[PDB]
Design a protein around this nucleic acid. Structure first.
Ligand code: A1IC4
Ligand code: K
Ligand code: K
Ligand code: K
Ligand code: K
Ligand code: K
Ligand code: K
Ligand code: K
Ligand code: K
Ligand code: K
Ligand code: K
Ligand code: K
Ligand code: K
Ligand code: K
Ligand code: MG
Ligand code: MG
Ligand code: MG
Ligand code: MG
Ligand code: MG
Ligand code: MG
Ligand code: MG
Ligand code: MG
Ligand code: MG
Ligand code: MG
Ligand code: MG
Ligand code: MG
Ligand code: MG
Ligand code: MG
Ligand code: MG
Ligand code: MG
Ligand code: MG
Ligand code: MG
Ligand code: MG
Ligand code: MG
Ligand code: MG
Ligand code: MG
Ligand code: MG
Ligand code: MG
Lengths: 106, 52, 54, 117, 88
RNA sequence: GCUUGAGUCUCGUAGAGGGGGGUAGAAUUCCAGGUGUAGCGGUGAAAUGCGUAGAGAUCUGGAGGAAUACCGGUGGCGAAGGCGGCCCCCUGGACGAAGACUGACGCUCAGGUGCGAAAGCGUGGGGAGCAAACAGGAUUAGAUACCCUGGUAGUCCACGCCGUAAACGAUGUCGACUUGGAGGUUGUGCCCUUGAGGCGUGGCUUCCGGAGCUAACGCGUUAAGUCGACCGCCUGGGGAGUACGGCCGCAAGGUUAAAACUCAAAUGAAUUGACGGGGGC
């Protein structure tokens, strides 16, 4: 059982479809009997460099436990969804649940 | 802010960044063996120096 | 323990104003932590939490 | 014939020649001069004096515009990156911001072979 | 590349005791399982020479252990090679 | 029989180890458009070349290929060749702590079988930059070169072939033993209150240096010291790693490998001078 960390940035104009996206992704995960160890939705922060002629984006962090297949599906939805401009799936040694510095600063 | 103080500031920032040395090194191609030779030579001197 | 790529504040202690990673011989960091630092800095630069250049 | 108070200066300083162009903030160029174009012809154009005279000629070329605030950027390693910026002061422009941009390829393309001189 | 449970169950099946992980039979059984597992990987990745070196090391180790067992006694050797489906 | 060699299992650690697939930023080139003018580019000096059909410069957008500033290290990994952005998938090895297990299962190998830089070859793609050949401009007494402007194969990918390098540590593999010092990197045990820190104990690695060894230079616990096991190889310089034959290869060629003849030398290290378009005063 692999633990993953997913960070994805979405076009700010779709940012009211972010409460929406989180829902289906968490759905798929628990659908596969996975556990959302951490969800954070710090958003509307300024980019360091422009991406796609844009200067800000909505961020979402999700530390999850899941099998590979659900992870690969998620990746493809990220690839095909036009609202998401960046995404990055990483493996983690164990489950992490303590608050990220992005929200503990808040 | 005086102009001249901004000039030396800019000069100091440019010297710290090291862009000019990078450009003068990327001007022509260096074969990997030769680059490795330079690196080894620069290490054998820094050592035989620090020791001295 | 692990150096987190999201923790931007400490990462800005190891990059110059131009965004280049500082040599470990200047920051006095151990080699293992320098490697984790470089990995985290690159990871952050991908997510645009840090700039590649100035 | 328009007036542009805030202007940019671009200083392309190569190992052989110096080019100074004053443009507006949006990048639409409005005057230019070169060390070779200033009267020098040949290796003489590589001298920092030629860079100063090129800066002066460009300043003359941009009098008709109402340029008084010059934001300077310099690109290149050649000997025209410091004399030129000291001549723009003598010309009279108020230098507000000065930046350095110089292409660093991050190991992109193979450079030409070494000269065996 | 075998999971811990698969290794443990192989050890339980070919060894005298659940702790008998060093016997020749269980060593040959684990080597055979790993080789069979890696066959698919090398079917997909024909230019992974560096990993194929470790696979060849496993093959040579099994050959040596089987030769030792054959010399030691032929009863257990024949039983094991018939149970594992090895030509020789 | 045995457990000390060899191996298996359990828990962790570090790593540019390998294969596959995605993706990011910088830069070069090209294309389209905007601004705008007489140069640009290049050299020792020039000239070919590019430019008012509007270049070079600057801004915006797009296409494409290749390589991954910084980190970066006398750092790390790999049997060697080699391996460097980031992410995922598959996968090899090494090391450490503690314990259990097997019970000499080992070492080294002629033939044999694999892997094997770059260049090269075949088929099919791709082609930004660079660039053998080549063209032009110089230089020169001549310049077929060095220098300049261009430029094709190639460099890139897939699948095959080739099988060679100063493929080098010019140092075969394995095991044992023999004074020290300073470092690097990576584990781990016990303790200051641990993170910092103080004592140990493993692996890998860099530089000095003792005895000893060596022709000398030097090597020196990672030996070129003291020994044992096995393998490879040498027998003056040329002729020659050539001819012929065999094997391999699509080919370039590779591999195995002589003799006639000829000379009395060829060679290594160091020493004193002389020189140098080598450095210092
Ligand atoms: N017989 C004949 O063919 O020509 C006469 C030859 O002796 C000339 C002599 N040439 C050179 O050194 C070559 N060195 C390598 C680069 C190219 C070339 O330059 C030479 O003196 N050069 C001068 C330049 C020159 C003068 N007249 C003609 N050419 C030179 O500058 N040489 C430099 C030096 O000697 O250190 C250096 O080689 C150089 C710098 N830049 C260039 Cl190009 N070469
Ligand atoms: K691995
Ligand atoms: K026993
Ligand atoms: K060229
Ligand atoms: K001559
Ligand atoms: K070409
Ligand atoms: K070949
Ligand atoms: K070498
Ligand atoms: K150590
Ligand atoms: K230690
Ligand atoms: K001597
Ligand atoms: K041998
Ligand atoms: K002879
Ligand atoms: K051919
Ligand atoms: Mg010049
Ligand atoms: Mg050139
Ligand atoms: Mg194993
Ligand atoms: Mg790897
Ligand atoms: Mg990979
Ligand atoms: Mg134009
Ligand atoms: Mg042989
Ligand atoms: Mg090749
Ligand atoms: Mg080809
Ligand atoms: Mg072709
Ligand atoms: Mg050329
Ligand atoms: Mg010619
Ligand atoms: Mg001629
Ligand atoms: Mg050909
Ligand atoms: Mg050879
Ligand atoms: Mg080599
Ligand atoms: Mg040899
Ligand atoms: Mg090693
Ligand atoms: Mg020594
Ligand atoms: Mg020895
Ligand atoms: Mg000797
Ligand atoms: Mg031959
Ligand atoms: Mg040959
Ligand atoms: Mg032959």
């Amino acid at each position: 059982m692999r633990h993953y960390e997913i960070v994805f940035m979405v076009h700010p104009d779709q940012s009211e479809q972010v409460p929406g996206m989180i829902e289906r992704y968490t759905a798929a995960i628990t659908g596969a009997e996975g556990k959302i160890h951490r969800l954070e939705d710090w958003g509307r922060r300024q980019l360091a460099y422009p991406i796609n002629k844009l200067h800000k984006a909505h961020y979402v962090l999700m530390n999850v436990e899941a099998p590979q297949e659900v992870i690969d599906e998620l990746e493809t939805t990220f690839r095909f969804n036009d609202a998401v401009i960046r995404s990055m799936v990483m493996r983690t040694k164990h489950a992490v649940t303590e608050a990220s510095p992005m929200v503990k600063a808040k | 802010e005086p102009f001249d103080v901004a000039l030396r500031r800019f000069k100091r920032s440019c010297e710290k960044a090291g862009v000019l040395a990078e450009v003068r090194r990327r001007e022509f191609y260096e074969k990997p063996t030769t680059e490795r030779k330079r690196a080894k030579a620069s290490a054998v001197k820094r050592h035989a120096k620090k020791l001295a | 323990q692990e150096i987190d790529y999201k923790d931007i504040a400490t990462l800005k202690n190891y990059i110059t104003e131009s965004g280049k990673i500082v040599p470990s011989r200047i920051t006095g960091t151990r080699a293992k932590y320098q490697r984790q630092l470089a990995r985290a800095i690159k990871r952050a630069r991908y997510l645009s939490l840090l700039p590649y250049t100035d | 014939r328009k007036q542009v108070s805030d202007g940019v200066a671009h200083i392309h300083a190569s190992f052989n020649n110096t080019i100074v162009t004053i443009t507006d903030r949006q990048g639409n160029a409005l005057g230019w001069a070169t060390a070779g174009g200033s009267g020098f012809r040949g290796s003489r154009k590589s001298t920092p004096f030629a860079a100063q005279v090129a800066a002066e000629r460009c300043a003359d070329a941009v009098k008709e515009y109402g340029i008084k605030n010059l934001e300077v950027m310099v690109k290149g390693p050649g000997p025209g990156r410091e004399s030129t910026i000291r001549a723009l002061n003598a010309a009279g422009f108020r230098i507000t911001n000065i930046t350095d941009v110089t292409p660093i390829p991050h190991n992109g393309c193979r450079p030409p072979k070494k000269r065996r001189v | 590349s075998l999971s811990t449970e698969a290794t443990a169950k192989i050890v339980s099946e070919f060894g005298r005791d659940a702790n008998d992980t060093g016997s020749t039979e269980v060593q040959v059984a684990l080597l055979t399982a790993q080789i069979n597992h890696l066959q698919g990987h090398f079917a997909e990745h024909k230019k992974d020479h560096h990993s194929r070196r470790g696979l060849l090391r496993m093959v040579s180790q099994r050959r040596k252990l089987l030769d030792y067992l054959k010399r030691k006694d032929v009863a257990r050797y024949t039983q094991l090679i018939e149970r594992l489906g090895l030509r020789r």
